[PDB]
Amino acid sequence: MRAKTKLIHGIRIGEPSTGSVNVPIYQTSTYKQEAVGKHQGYEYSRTGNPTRAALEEMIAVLENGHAGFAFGSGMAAITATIMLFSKGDHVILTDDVYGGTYRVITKVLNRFGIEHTFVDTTNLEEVEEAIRPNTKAIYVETPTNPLLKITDIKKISTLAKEKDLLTIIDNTFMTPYWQSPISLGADIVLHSATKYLGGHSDVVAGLVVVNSPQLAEDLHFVQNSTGGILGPQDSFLLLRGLKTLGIRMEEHETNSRAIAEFLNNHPKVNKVYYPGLESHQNHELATEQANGFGAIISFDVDSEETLNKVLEKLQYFTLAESLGAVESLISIPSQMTHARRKELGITDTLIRISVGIEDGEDLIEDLAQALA
Amino acid sequence: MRAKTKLIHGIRIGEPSTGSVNVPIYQTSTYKQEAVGKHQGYEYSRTGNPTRAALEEMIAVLENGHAGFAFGSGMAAITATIMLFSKGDHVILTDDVYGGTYRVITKVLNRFGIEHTFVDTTNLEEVEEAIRPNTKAIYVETPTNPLLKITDIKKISTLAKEKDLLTIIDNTFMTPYWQSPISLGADIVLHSATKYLGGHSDVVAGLVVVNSPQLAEDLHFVQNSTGGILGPQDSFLLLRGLKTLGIRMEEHETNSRAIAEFLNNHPKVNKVYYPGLESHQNHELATEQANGFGAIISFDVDSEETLNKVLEKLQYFTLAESLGAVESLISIPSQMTHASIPADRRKELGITDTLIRISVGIEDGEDLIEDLAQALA
Amino acid sequence: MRAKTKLIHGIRIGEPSTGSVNVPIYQTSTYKQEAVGKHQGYEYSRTGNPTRAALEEMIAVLENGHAGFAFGSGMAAITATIMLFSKGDHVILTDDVYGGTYRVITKVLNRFGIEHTFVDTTNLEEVEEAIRPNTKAIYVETPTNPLLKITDIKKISTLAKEKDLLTIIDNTFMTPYWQSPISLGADIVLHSATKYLGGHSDVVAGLVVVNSPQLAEDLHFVQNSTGGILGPQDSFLLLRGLKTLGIRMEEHETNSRAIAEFLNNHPKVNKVYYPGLESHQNHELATEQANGFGAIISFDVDSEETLNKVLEKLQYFTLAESLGAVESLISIPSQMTHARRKELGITDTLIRISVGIEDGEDLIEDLAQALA
Amino acid sequence: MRAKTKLIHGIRIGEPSTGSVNVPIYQTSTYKQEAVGKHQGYEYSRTGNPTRAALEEMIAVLENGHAGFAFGSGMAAITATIMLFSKGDHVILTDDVYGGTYRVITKVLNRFGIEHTFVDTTNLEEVEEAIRPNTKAIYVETPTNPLLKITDIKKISTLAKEKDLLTIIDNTFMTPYWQSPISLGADIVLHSATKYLGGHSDVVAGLVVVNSPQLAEDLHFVQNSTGGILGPQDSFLLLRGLKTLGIRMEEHETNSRAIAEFLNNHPKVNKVYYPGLESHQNHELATEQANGFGAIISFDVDSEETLNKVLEKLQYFTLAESLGAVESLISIPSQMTHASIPADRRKELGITDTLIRISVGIEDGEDLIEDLAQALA
């Protein structure tokens, strides 16, 4: 089936007991057993919950992977994944990963003897030079938050496999709809479902898909033991979100390309980050490993006074944390993303916009009037 | 406020926006800021959500604590708490801690350099000679699952404070209604809110209460960084359950004392574990550090055929894992919780494969006793 | 099984498909059919919804009736019930019914040619004298909101049956736990589930139980045709509420008797309405047709200045509409119950309290300090 | 604002309490009052609930109306609206109105003295000579279920205003995205929000928008008095669905035009009902009063055996009542909706027992056409 179809029919429509065209919300902690260990399906909602299970199956189907896992946040998904490894293991990470990943690697998991190196994963020579004897995994975010740097998933995966390393990809920004990391060699693909997958700024959730029975047993053990699960009401809202992922990302795409084009040709804007501009580092790779450029744009305005006046005049962009929502969001990474900032090239005049599904024309006019 | 009033007025009734007598469900990820850094207290739901904030405050109130933290499960609460420690730290634990706790200490957190010693925490001498220079805390579960063994919280706390150690208490079985560990000198108290606090078998949740601002900054940092948060719908259902925790535990208590007496005098029952029997180890301590015995009773029946007849015939006890629900539940520890441990140490901590665990609900007491009676004869 | 047991085991614990000890929330409008008209159980959520159906079965079991029906409010329950009748039919009602029932009878259903007489149902001679040829039903609320007048359900039912009339009882204040109208001859018993049945001030719902297959077909047709249904999330919260109805009403009872006793012996309070006082009209009948006196108290203080000062000083009673909640509520019927007020004896110094499950001692001390 | 922006910024983003970009779910019955009559706008959830208030405002915005009202179902919305009238009032209705509407008019509201005449509302002469002195409104459903027959809303409205009658439009099939009845002169517009507005087959709800304060006082009085309200959870899910109504209907439209063309040229299909075919009655009107044709297509297949093969073989159309969902749905009107009516008037309004109704979802267009193609051959 085509991608739009898979979002509606990835799992069996018609719940067995009643024919409900939706997954029921199993707001329950426990399950009556017929005999000692013989109501097989479900035993305890931490271990498995039918609403969460439908969600875990759906994300595995959408990334073409072996098994899915649902966590209370993106950060719980990221933490459970790194907790596959042990004291003495080493991880290589994209140098401009999300600040939350930066923080958990450097301020939490360091205290547990998990070692890291931050590397420019755009430079495959530097990635290979970072490999230690105790290295177990390469972790890549593409595009990155918020500079949208593009890393070659197929080349990172090939290097990882040659050196006996797992490839972990944060596919949050592209979603399963635009990019397929497992198809390009990734062992583990993960999502802040809080962003595009839910799509309506109303769920905090993380998803992990693994490509192997061994990884599914090992991540299941971590999720069941440390228990950072997604509840069934949130699981239901996330399943509901997934239904419109295709038509949302298509409208996001159309709006964002026109906005990147207009912002890149503006007197008050001297640099624009967006995979769909030919000027963007690795634009060519962006067109090859993904079917869309996404809906996150970062742009550097000429002065503090331009920034401030953009914030106070914008009508349809809401000043807030997060992204991936049907409504347009704006943040100032320099004043809103704490967790080298200078080294990464995150200017004090840099603005990040999350482009919504408002009319593309209203969003351009709103940005124009804001910079006029 | 008396105890029953606290469960209702622990936090202000009337939210500031509309006066709603209930906490609204903030099904939301993010908040509009007036200016970059000016926001009315909420910026991103993982860091703080107002529904979760009301629940975290409520449980902090009920435990007389500095601040509360809500997690997606009891196991997330225990994990987040032990993750306050770092590689080369040592924790002393109660030896018959809950299975899920055993597993996180011995199969997960061991891989992260956190060391442990399992000790009989009923023996303050043995606790003391497990203290190493890298020891940071003593973790106590009282009463224990499933033998309801009792640990002197006030004695553990005073030993701990004397050796500059943190005291952590798993107060799930007693709840804040019967036992107040921070009052007895605990630094940290946590709950599988999945049990009594929710009380309706319909929320999986963990709660942690800390009694210092330093512990609140540190555990908040872990919560926000590792993100095992409870969502707003579960937060609401757990707040809702908290409202009837006092009257639920009073009914649980009355059914349980009568069933514990009933089972202790039945001829097919060799041994009964319940803190309320005068014959139970540290019954005297149980009556000093808590205002109730629980609603959990384990009893050793006379034979395999009896065990199978009671599972066969009970009408009002449902066979299922978990406990602390308004509906009565039964499990066989040997085949359902302590299947992991060998038969070796299952005679040590006396877990026969004729031991039954019942969680006494709020059905009519006389219905539950009649039900046990018919099943057993 | 005893009453406390029935609240936990009235319906089968263990949902067929997974063994869940709870009813799943069927957040769904429609159901896949195997063949044209052959997924039998469920077809469309207006007509039937499995969460709503569990709730409808539970309330029928708790009132020992034939079938249950769940509506979006008490007033939707009351309206669907009167809409069993037609233009030209006449209904007799307790003269001091809830203001909402007063309003729908006199300002809505009058425009549809449903005729009414309001009668003192404490006076069975006046009830019999009110019967017209076009009379179809006697509608009784006992105790009444807010004066707690007690009507003889068995004598009203016997008169109704002799004259070919249906008996409809609003059992909201007593709940199924304290009073059983069907057992005393009632054909229809109904509830504002918004009050004690939900019990936590967090659901608006109405329930109707009927005693006959004919009434179940006729009310089902009205509920399915006019569609004032309770949604499945509210149905789930109401099922959850019912679980603690017994232990709640027992604590309500203990607190309320002590409060009625203290209020009735107070210098600043010159009259107290509460079924459990020997001085209350028909106290004897109250002890006979119900197992409890309930948790609503109305009291007349000596002056406006006493009332005002009670309102501003009470610590544990919240000034709000509604009742039946675990938290204590206070209202002034003279300034808060619009929809004869003088005729009914609703003084401008009359206070209604809904007694909660706070500690009974804290509630007395709070009322004392408030009148000191 | 363009149409797509309105579905997102129709109401203020950022609630006043915390700045939440989402409407909080007010799972609550009542509100603390400061003083007897001072309350911050909410007193009792049946009269007003803030989550329901946001949805009622949103649908009022999208329909360019005075005020909105949310009910527990489409049928509660129609019932509440017709209950604005009294015994001895007369309403003229579109003759092939939805079955549930037929039933409430002819089996419920007839018993309450409300009179009706069913008329072909495509014939303004016939509408006019059904007007009696006791007539108060003309009720129009355009397009109709299941033959998608089209009624001139602007002509009906002007006839109505000339005879001092109210115009009521059931705008369910078009939604506020394609058709704006109040703009064409309607006083009242309503929706089965169960269909497109929710869009995920997971909420039963009705909405009514009125264009005068007198109609807002009167319908609010009915809503509050008779109490067929939508609860806060359903209100939230319906708000959520509204967010994607524009992009859902654009995708629905593209799949439907292609499937309507596909079916109209297939050799096993005699007749196709769809406002978008140039051959459909009042195609010209359809293109003037609405900016889209729908996502509902009825088609008459060649025989019983074809009908049974398509039900047998379709993979992506689910057999089920209802429509307007992201997942594609199929029904047989003769056996599922118009089983009530005799075979007598089922040849009049041409409802063969080989007529299939499909609701086109937002699956890949080419998947749905391939699916119909394989099923039909």
Ligand SMILES: Cc1ncc(COP(=O)(O)O)c(C=O)c1O
């Ligand atoms: C005392 C105690 N602590 C912790 C837990 C674990 O909680 P959860 O199942 O919510 O992860 C349990 C569960 O049985 C328990 O009984």
Ligand SMILES: Cc1ncc(COP(=O)(O)O)c(C=O)c1O
């Ligand atoms: C046009 C139209 N109006 C009203 C309704 C009735 O709505 P509900 O099923 O929510 O009562 C429907 C349902 O099919 C409909 O299609």
Ligand SMILES: *Cc1c(COP(=O)(O)O)cnc(C)c1O
């Ligand atoms: C927002 C974000 C996260 C964190 O998700 P939470 O749900 O906030 O824990 C992780 N990765 C990326 C790329 C993100 O954008």
Ligand SMILES: *Cc1c(COP(=O)(O)O)cnc(C)c1O
């Ligand atoms: C509150 C009340 C009602 C009305 O219930 P709603 O849920 O508000 O419609 C009806 N009858 C009685 C006796 C009440 O107390």
